[PDB]
Design a protein around this ligand. Structure first.
Ligand SMILES: NC(=O)c1ccc[n+]([C@@H]2O[C@H](COP(=O)([O-])OP(=O)(O)OC[C@H]3O[C@@H](n4cnc5c(N)ncnc54)[C@H](OP(=O)(O)O)[C@@H]3O)[C@@H](O)[C@H]2O)c1
Ligand SMILES: NC(=O)c1ccc[n+]([C@@H]2O[C@H](COP(=O)([O-])OP(=O)(O)OC[C@H]3O[C@@H](n4cnc5c(N)ncnc54)[C@H](OP(=O)(O)O)[C@@H]3O)[C@@H](O)[C@H]2O)c1
Ligand SMILES: [Cl-]
Ligand SMILES: [Cl-]
Lengths: 364, 364
C-alpha cells in the first residue's frame, strides 16, 4: 500500500463514495488501504467495498482511544460525519469533540500521518439553518469570505483542526465545503436524492401526481449541488497534491440548475406522467408524507425493498429546507485556479444517483 | 507556419484577442500565420499584433473576391463580425451575405482550408432583442435546445455555413455562442466593459456617485459573461481538436455573478467612494449620459485620451439592454464534456479588461 485511509463516517453520503473510490486501482495516491468508521453494524449496501469496517463512536474519547489509536499505519484521515443536536452551542460542543477525539486518538500513534481532510459545507457562509434574520453572505460564496459573527460548529471544528495540526510538523489539512449532496447513503441525515426518490416512488405507487412540495421561489430559482463522488475526488486530490495544502475549498458540480427542470427528470425516471408545481398543494414533505407508513409497507412487501422503515430513507425535514430556498450558490473559481478541474453535469449526476436507490432496492 | 488564420473582424472585441493570441509560441496549432480583416484603417491599439492586416468590406462580394481569394494559404477561418440593421429580416440578409461572401471567396481558392469557426451568441436561445413576448427557452441554455420559431440571423448564418461547407469534404466547422463579452475593442458595437469604463471615468471626473443605471432585478440577479481571450481559446481549441468538429458550443466564464458585486469592483478600480443602487436614479445610460459631450472633451484633453468621440466608446444602448435583464445564463457542460476545460474568474476578468481600457488611454 502507498497510502492508508481512515474514513470517519464510512456509511455516510460521502463516506460511502470514498470507501468505493479509494481502493480502485487508478485512484491517485494508490494503492490504498482503507479503514472505515461508523457506529451501526455495516449495512449490506456498504458491504462490497474492500475496507476494514470499524464500529466506533467518535463522541466517546475512550472508544476512540481504544479503537482508533491501534491504527498505526494511517496516513490520511477523511472526516465526513456530524451529529445533529437541538441547539447550536450543543452542536459546537458535540461536533468539535468528535473531531478532537479522532485527531487526539490518531496523531500521537500514527507516525506516518500526512494529511487530514475535514468536510463541512455551505452553512459556513450562511450559518445554521436557524439563522433566519441574522447576518449572512451574498452568493456566490467564496472561500475567503470572512466568518459570520454568529455561532457555527464548522468554525469550532476548523479551530480545533488548526490547533491540533499546528502541534505537529508532518501533517497538512484541507477543508471541503459542499452544497446539497447528490449521493447514495440510506443512512445519511441529509439526503435530497434519496428522499425525493422515496417521495416519487410513493406517488408512482399511489398513481398520484408528482407535485412539487416546496416554494415557488425554489421552483424557479437557480441552485447548485455537489455530487458525492466529485466530493470524494476533490478530497483525494487535496490529500495527494501538495499544491492544495492548508486551504479550504468549495466543492460543487460547477453548473447551475432549476428545480423546475430536475422535477421533470425525476418524474421521467419514475414513469410519472403527471408532474408539476401547483400552489396550495406545495405543503412540504413533512406534512404531505404524514401517514404514509401503511402504503410504504405495501410497497416494500410488493417490491422486495430493503429498508422497511419509512422515516429512515424518507428524510422529509431536510428536503423541506432545500426546497424552500433559492440562489444559495458557491463559487468553484478557487478550485479551478488551484488546478482541480473536476465537474459534474447535474442532470446526469441526478439521474445516476436515482439509479442507485433503485439498484440497491431502496425504491422500486 | 503550421496553420494560417483568416480573422474576419480583427479589430473587434474577439478579433483583437485572436490576433494577439494566435501568434504566440505556445498556441495550439502553431506556429500561426495570421491575416486580419476589417474595413477601417488599422487603429493604433490593434497595431502590436504580428498579423497581416487587410482592409476589406465583406458585405461586398467583389471586394471579398479581390482581397480574400488571393489568400490561398489559409487553413482556418475565424468569423467574428456582424452588422447591426434596423429589422431582423435585413439583419438576416446582410449578415448572411457577409458570411456567404467570405466562404465563397476562400473555399474555392484555399486548397488547404481545414476549418471555419463561426461566432454567434446567446441570442440563439432568446431571439433578437426585440423578441419581448414571443417564445423563449428556459435558462440555463444548452446547445441541443431546438431553434425558436422566430426569425434570427444566427440561424440564417448557420444554414449558410452548413450549405457552403457541405460542398467540400475536407473542411469542418464549429459554432461558438458567447454571452455578454468582456474584452478590449473601442470599435466593438456591443461592449459592456468599455462602456461601463467610460461611464465610471465620467462619474470620477465629475466627482459624482457611481449610480447603477439599470433595473433592480439586474442588480440582484445572477448573470454570466464571456471573456474575449477565453472565447479565442475555445475557437482555437475547436480549430485543432479532433473531438470538437462540426459542433456548436456555448462559451462563458463558467461562473456566475451579480451586478451588485461587480459594481463595487468597478467603483474601486476607478477610485470612486460613492457608489450603489438608488431607485429613481436608474434611468439608463442613454438618458443619464445625455449632454455629457462637454465633460468628455475636458477629460480627453486633460488625460490625453485616444478616442475623442464619446459615442464611439460610450455605447449606451447595449449597456442598457444588458443592465435590464437577469438569469440569462448558458451551460458550459457540453464544452467540459468535450474536453474544453477553459474558464475565467469573472471578478478577475472584469478587472483585467478594465485595466486595458486604462492602459490604451481610452479612459483615465
Ligand atoms: N449530506 C449533505 O447533503 C451535506 C451537504 C452539505 C454539507 N454537509 C456536511 O458534511 C459533513 C458530513 O456529513 P454527511 O452528510 O456526509 O454525513 P452523513 O451522510 O449523515 O453520514 C454520517 C456518517 O457518520 C456516522 N456517524 C454519525 N455519528 C457518528 C459517531 N458519533 N461516531 C462514528 N460515526 C458516526 C454515520 O453512521 P452511524 O450513524 O452508523 O454512526 C455515517 O456513516 C457535515 O458537516 C454536513 O453538515 C452535508
Ligand atoms: N460583443 C458582445 O458582447 C457579443 C456577445 C455575444 C455575441 N456576440 C456576437 O459576436 C459576433 C461577432 O460580433 P463582435 O461583438 O465580436 O463584433 P465587434 O466587436 O463589433 O467587431 C466587428 C469587427 O468586424 C469589422 N467589421 C464590421 N463590419 C465589417 C465588414 N462589412 N467587413 C469587414 N469587417 C467588418 C469591424 O471593423 P470595421 O467596422 O472597421 O469594419 C470589427 O473589426 C456577433 O454575432 C455578435 O452578435 C457579441
Ligand atoms: Cl452545510
Ligand atoms: Cl448574442
Amino acid at each position: 500500500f502507498e497510502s492508508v485511509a481512515l474514513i470517519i463516517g464510512v456509511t455516510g453520503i460521502v463516506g460511502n463514495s470514498l470507501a468505493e473510490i479509494l481502493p480502485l486501482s487508478d485512484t491517485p495516491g494508490g494503492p490504498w488501504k482503507v479503514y472505515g468508521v461508523a457506529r451501526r453494524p455495516r449495512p449490506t449496501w456498504n458491504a462490497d467495498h474492500p475496507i476494514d469496517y470499524i464500529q466506533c463512536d467518535v463522541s466517546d474519547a475512550e472508544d476512540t482511544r481504544s479503537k482508533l489509536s491501534p491504527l498505526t499505519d494511517v496516513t490520511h484521515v477523511f472526516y465526513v460525519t456530524w451529529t445533529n443536536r437541538e441547539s447550536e452551542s450543543e452542536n459546537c460542543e458535540a461536533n468539535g469533540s468528535m473531531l478532537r477525539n479522532v485527531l487526539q486518538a490518531i496523531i500521537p500513534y500514527a507516525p506516518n500521518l500526512r494529511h487530514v481532510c475535514l468536510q463541512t459545507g455551505t452553512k459556513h457562509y450562511l450559518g445554521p439553518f436557524t439563522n433566519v434574520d441574522g447576518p449572512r453572505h451574498d452568493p456566490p460564496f467564496t472561500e475567503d469570505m470572512p466568518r459570520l459573527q454568529i455561532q457555527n460548529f464548522y468554525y469550532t471544528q476548523e479551530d480545533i483542526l488548526f490547533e491540533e495540526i499546528k502541534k505537529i510538523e508532518t501533517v497538512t489539512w484541507s477543508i471541503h465545503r459542499p452544497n446539497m449532496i447528490f449521493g447514495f447513503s440510506p443512512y445519511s441525515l441529509m439526503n435530497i436524492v434519496g428522499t425525493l426518490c422515496v417521495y416519487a416512488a410513493i406517488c408512482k405507487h399511489e398513481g398520484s401526481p408528482l407535485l412539487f412540495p416546496g416554494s415557488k421561489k425554489a421552483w424557479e430559482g437557480f441552485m447548485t449541488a455537489s455530487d458525492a463522488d466529485l466530493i470524494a475526488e476533490q478530497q483525494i486530490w487535496a490529500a495527494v497534491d501538495p499544491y492544495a495544502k492548508n486551504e479550504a475549498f468549495n466543492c460543487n458540480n460547477a453548473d447551475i440548475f432549476k428545480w423546475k427542470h430536475l422535477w421533470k427528470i425525476l418524474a421521467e425516471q419514475f414513469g410519472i406522467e403527471e408532474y408539476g408545481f401547483e400552489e396550495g398543494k406545495n405543503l412540504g414533505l413533512v406534512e404531505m408524507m404524514k401517514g404514509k407508513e401503511r402504503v410504504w409497507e405495501e410497497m416494500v412487501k410488493e417490491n422486495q425493498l430493503q429498508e422497511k422503515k419509512l422515516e429512515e430513507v424518507g428524510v422529509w425535514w431536510f428536503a423541506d429546507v432545500i426546497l424552500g430556498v433559492e440562489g444559495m450558490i458557491d463559487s468553484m473559481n478557487k478550485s479551478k485556479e488551484y488546478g482541480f478541474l473536476g465537474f459534474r453535469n447535474s442532470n446526469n449526476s441526478f439521474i445516476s444517483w436515482i439509479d442507485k436507490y433503485k439498484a440497491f432496492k431502496i425504491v422500486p
